[PDB]
Design an enzyme around this catalytic site. Structure first.
Site, PDB file in Angstrom:
ATOM      1  N   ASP A  81     -19.714   6.474 -24.554  1.00 18.38           N
ATOM      2  CA  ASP A  81     -18.378   6.372 -23.959  1.00 18.38           C
ATOM      3  C   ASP A  81     -17.994   7.692 -23.272  1.00 18.38           C
ATOM      4  OD1 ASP A  81     -15.765   4.614 -23.733  1.00 18.38           O
ATOM      5  OD2 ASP A  81     -15.089   6.492 -24.646  1.00 18.38           O
ATOM      6  N   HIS A 125     -18.845  -2.878 -27.158  1.00 20.55           N
ATOM      7  CA  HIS A 125     -18.588  -1.485 -26.804  1.00 20.55           C
ATOM      8  C   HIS A 125     -19.004  -0.463 -27.859  1.00 20.55           C
ATOM      9  CE1 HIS A 125     -16.889   1.985 -24.929  1.00 20.55           C
ATOM     10  NE2 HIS A 125     -16.214   2.260 -26.048  1.00 20.55           N
ATOM     11  N   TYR A 132      -8.910  11.194 -20.615  1.00 23.85           N
ATOM     12  CA  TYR A 132      -8.629  10.260 -19.506  1.00 23.85           C
ATOM     13  C   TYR A 132      -7.636  10.827 -18.486  1.00 23.85           C
ATOM     14  CZ  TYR A 132     -10.487   6.425 -22.491  1.00 23.85           C
ATOM     15  OH  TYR A 132     -11.277   5.624 -23.278  1.00 23.85           O
TER      16      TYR A 132
HETATM   17 BR1  LIG Z   1     -10.575   1.960 -26.255  1.00 22.66          BR
HETATM   18  C1  LIG Z   1     -11.990   0.954 -25.487  1.00 22.66           C
HETATM   19  C2  LIG Z   1     -12.731   1.554 -24.493  1.00 22.66           C
HETATM   20  C3  LIG Z   1     -13.753   0.840 -23.904  1.00 22.66           C
HETATM   21  C4  LIG Z   1     -14.025  -0.448 -24.317  1.00 22.66           C
HETATM   22  C5  LIG Z   1     -13.298  -1.065 -25.318  1.00 22.66           C
HETATM   23  N1  LIG Z   1     -13.596  -2.319 -25.692  1.00 22.66           N
HETATM   24  C6  LIG Z   1     -12.853  -2.863 -26.664  1.00 22.66           C
HETATM   25  C7  LIG Z   1     -11.810  -2.228 -27.299  1.00 22.66           C
HETATM   26  C8  LIG Z   1     -11.517  -0.946 -26.890  1.00 22.66           C
HETATM   27  C9  LIG Z   1     -12.264  -0.343 -25.897  1.00 22.66           C
END
Ligand SMILES: Brc1cccc2ncccc12
Ligand SMILES: Brc1cccc2ncccc12
EC number: 3.3.2.10
Lengths: 545, 545
Positions: free
Chosen positions: A334, A523, A465
């Site tokens: 991420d 994710h 962000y």
């Molecule tokens: Br915070 C976030 C960032 C990216 C993807 C995601 N998917 C599901 C729930 C939260 C998420």
């Protein structure tokens, strides 16, 4: 009623038994049956082997005494030993060939998971051979799965003497009737049985396990594939580095070998790598699992600028400087995945190899403002909701348990929509007050994230962000560059934000790029598919880093 | 008036200059003079080299462009390049052959010690070669001795453009007249001079240094041998491992490579290894400098039994378990030296190699009580004074600054007599209220020990001496054993307590024992003779561990 399980090392938790080597050597060298085995137990409880097992002498002191006994045994059955015969050589190979009996360890793990006290009871030696590390490594991997490790050479007692059995029961704090004892040697089982313990003679593992499950009432055979080893936070080595006057970085450290720096995403922790840390350390790597800036025990300054990619990367370089590490392999997920591509582009001399889970490498568009780019894709709406300081903080900080329970879900679970978050007025507006517990996490693991986020909250994490313009300007300086160091891109099929197709053009900027793909993975890659993450990372690390 | 010194990397802080390689290659390959050097600077500020130095492209992207320029240059002077000519090969060798110019670094160190702000200003590249770690290591060793490192590829500016010079002055926060700038390139020196900076053209180091000392008024040439690099506690990575519910162990960690565990003596700290930590990490080792149980940031439980050798060793084994280290080389001094011999005797599989400073290995006498043995030698009287709980604590804790100033002295300094301490009624009874400062320590270093000892005091440290009977009984279990793993015994000539002759019979129990001897060295080995300690340890580590 049983509540304790005891296991032998040789022939039970470890295979092939270092005993069956004397027999194999006799057969291979056409030597008389039992010749080497006789020399091994020569003098019974007063001989070299008993002194070795009691810790009176070390393995290197025993080697010449075993050699003497081998000659005296060959003298009696009027035979001659091959000119090249070496006890050290035979034992070095035997110890080296001996591996963990995985189904036996799985059974012990399962018994301990159901509330059993587990122990290893073994007749062993003080290993001072130049190649002793092999067994030291094996003992380390085995022992951490048990409550107790009782070694004959450490306690000065030996199986079958009954004092070791009474010692075992004293350490277990249990009556013999509450104890299962598994041994491959009938004579060593006997005192445990005549004391009233449940006993199992272990020949083949499957039969021993059938006996073990019949006797405990717990399924141990044909059980589903277990999850990888996780981390107990209080059992970890915790590290702290001051990267600048107001900034300290926290990390968990496990293993020896090349340094592997793990960089979590939003809103995570070092603990997001709980299933990777023991696996990667076991694979021969020095794992450094970070609490990224703004998280857990790392400093969380309030200023937005403190979280732009340029400063975060410089701080990670300082972290390496202060630890005395010229390089580390950088593994990110991420926001950590984004940092890790920028570490490779701006500091390639400090990056051994770069790996990213879900986060693609997409060069900055110098002809478009990053705000415009984020708006062009409906899935990046959550990023726009994260812009206004205080808005996402209030919603995310309102009920911590609800935040993590709502966020941390597998693809099949009723996940939050990352679409129309601004219009809806938040992330959890269509989410329940009391979310169900995801199959990926336990209640305890949720409470760890809850406790961790109580220190600094979501300001610092959300500030990652809030530097889109700053990061875009910095990234534009790298537009002429290519990533030519070893690199791995791991895509997760069901990540609806960091979609696998967003990574499709990466070979244009990273020509030697290697790939991994996890099907039916959301994710939260590390906890959703831990076994496959470990498999992909270990394989890539061993080949390229 | 000068207060800042700026140094170039190539041809100034690092030698031989990576520039003189194009000339060497031309001469070695009988190629036209300046052929390779022309191709290197082809296109001036718009060519491949300027883009490389500005960070537009990486070294691996520049390699094929330099090769193209090499052909176009050979085309004009109508010549042909050897079939085996490789720019990568030439540069790999050049970078690899380039080492730190030690007298230049010594001068920079001396200038910074006198209050100067020091900086490295360099035209460099983003190194993404597979062999990039070599230079990454070199940059790491150099940079930590300077206040600033300004790299052209990181700032997007280049020498001789004047924006980098104004950038330099801005980072220095100094007017040009307060700045010395040393460069081996006349053209790169020129903008610094025309701005009003003091400048030095560096050809040979000696002349450059004569100019540097004439201009600063500080002796830099023919200066005494400097002390090794020390540790600034707040610049270290601090590690913490819980070895049991009430016991946490603190350690400072520096470097990569085989784990080297440093175990201090009484009444010390991890900081007692301040001169060894940077040296051993630089030699290719992962240094783990402990705060032993009862000291600094490690737990200090009150119970005497918590400090017997058996529990201390078991706790050190748990420390290895929790860090995921199958082995470490154990290096001890004083009480740490004793622990380290017991780690080797009871846990040889966990000990890569064992080294002890001053502390000999003497097997326990099973026919004599340890109290009798200590009494038989007048130098061990201090140990008898340490027996009564509270007596030595009160004297040692009364004035912390006086304690460390009285204890930490070189052999030529008016050291405490360890003879007739009980009769005298203490360690400092014939010692001044305000001891002079030893040449081994600064006032600041004394204050670090003072601050460290304010947390737990002397109870836990003194408890190491209060388990003589317990340790003797445990040691007697090891009487049949020999130490057969790599071992080093370092003797200190002027240690009047741990005398070199007390180590004379060690080969009887440690046959392969290697030795070291430090002349004119007192009890505090590491700080008394840091340079020779480092020399002996590095040499032994590289050969045996
Ligand atoms: Br915070 C976030 C960032 C990216 C993807 C995601 N998917 C599901 C729930 C939260 C998420
Ligand atoms: Br405490 C201690 C232990 C061993 C030797 C010593 N020498 C001088 C001053 C103190 C000493």
């Amino acid at each position: 009623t049983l509540r304790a399980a005891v296991f032998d090392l040789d022939g039970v938790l470890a295979l092939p038994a270092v005993f069956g080597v004397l027999g194999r050597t006799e057969e291979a060298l056409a030597l008389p049956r039992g010749l080497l085995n006789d020399a091994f137990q020569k003098g019974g409880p007063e001989g070299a082997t008993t002194r070795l097992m009691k810790g009176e002498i070390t393995l290197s002191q025993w080697i010449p005494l075993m050699e003497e006994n081998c000659r005296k045994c060959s003298e009696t059955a009027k035979v001659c030993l091959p000119k090249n015969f070496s006890i050290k050589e035979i034992f070095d190979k035997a110890i080296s060939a001996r591996k963990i009996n995985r189904p036996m360890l799985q059974a012990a793990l399962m018994l301990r998971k159901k509330g059993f006290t587990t122990a290893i009871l073994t007749n062993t030696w003080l290993d001072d051979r130049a190649e002793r590390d092999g067994l030291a490594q094996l003992m380390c991997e085995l022992k951490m799965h048990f409550d107790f490790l009782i070694e004959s050479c450490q306690v000065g007692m030996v199986k079958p003497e009954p004092q070791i059995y009474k010692f075992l029961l004293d350490t277990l704090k249990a009556s013999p009737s509450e104890v299962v004892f598994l041994d491959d040697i009938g004579a060593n089982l006997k005192p445990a049985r005549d004391l009233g313990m449940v006993t199992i003679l272990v020949q083949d593992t499957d039969t021993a396990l059938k006996e073990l499950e019949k006797v405990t009432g717990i399924q141990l055979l044909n059980t589903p594939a277990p999850l990888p080893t996780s981390c107990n936070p209080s059992d970890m080595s915790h590290g702290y580095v001051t990267v600048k006057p107001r900034v300290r970085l926290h990390f968990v450290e496990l293993g020896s070998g090349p340094a592997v720096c793990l960089c979590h995403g939003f809103p995570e922790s070092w603990y997001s790598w709980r299933y990777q840390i023991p696996a990667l350390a076991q694979a021969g790597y020095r794992v450094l699992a970070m609490d990224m800036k703004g998280y857990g025990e790392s400093s969380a300054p309030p200023e937005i600028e403190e979280y732009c990619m340029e400063v975060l990367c410089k701080e990670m370089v300082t972290f390496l400087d202060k630890l005395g590490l010229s390089q580390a392999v950088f593994i990110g997920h991420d926001w950590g995945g984004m940092l890790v591509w920028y570490m490779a582009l701006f500091y390639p001399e400090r990056v051994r190899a770069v790996a990213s889970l879900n986060t693609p490498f997409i060069p900055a568009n110098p002809n478009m403002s990053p705000l415009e780019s984020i708006k062009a894709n409906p899935v990046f709406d959550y990023q726009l909701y994260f812009q206004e300081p205080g808005v996402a903080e209030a919603e995310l900080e309102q009920n911590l348990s609800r935040t993590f329970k709502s966020l941390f879900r597998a693809s099949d679970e009723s996940v939050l929509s990352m679409h129309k978050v601004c219009e809806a007025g938040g992330l959890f507006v269509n989410s329940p007050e009391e979310p169900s517990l995801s199959r990926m996490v336990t209640e305890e693991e949720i409470q760890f994230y809850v406790q961790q986020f109580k220190k600094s909250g979501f300001r610092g994490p959300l500030n990652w962000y809030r530097n889109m313009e700053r990061n875009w300007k910095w990234a534009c300086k790298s537009l002429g560059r290519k990533i030519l160091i070893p690199a791995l891109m791991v895509t997760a099929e069901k990540d609806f934000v960091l979609v696998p197709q967003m990574s499709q053009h990466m070979e244009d900027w990273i020509p030697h790029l290697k790939r991994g793909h996890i099907e039916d993975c959301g994710h939260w890659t590390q906890m959703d598919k831990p076994t496959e993450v470990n498999q992909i990372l270990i394989k890539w690390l061993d080949s390229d880093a």
